[PDB]
DNA sequence: ATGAGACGCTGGCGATTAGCTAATCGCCAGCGTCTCATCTTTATGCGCC
């Protein structure tokens, strides 16, 4: 999909450490980063639906 | 006593990839014999209810 909102965009130092190219971060970065997501999430900064994108990886990245 | 519902280049090319009767004409066609007998039938020729 083309998304040019926040709900999907980042801000990295460089775009080789999400993982794969061609699906949502891998699960490296969300077993690595899952402690500063929630805490993002209780900051009131990201939404629900950018901590559920940032967190789908783990319920099974994304299917076809 | 919250967290789902909304999903692509195809058509128009080439260029493979595959496959098929039909219309025209020519060629060329197993054949050789004899014996033996056997019957017919025909042409002509001869007769009155």
Same mark, same amino acid.
């Given at each position: 999909? %083309? ?7 980042? +801000? ?7 993982? $794969?190219? !061609? =699906? ?7 077993? %690595? ?7 993002? +999430? ?7 639906? $950018?901590? !559920? =994108? ?11």
């Amino acid at each position: 999909l %083309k998304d040019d909102s926040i709900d999907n965009k980042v +801000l990295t130092r460089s775009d080789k450490n999400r993982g $794969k190219s !061609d =699906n949502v971060p891998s699960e490296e970065v969300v077993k %690595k980063m899952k402690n500063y997501w929630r805490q993002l +999430l209780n900051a009131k900064l990201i939404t629900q639906r $950018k901590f !559920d =994108n940032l967190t789908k990886a783990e319920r099974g990245g994304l299917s076809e």
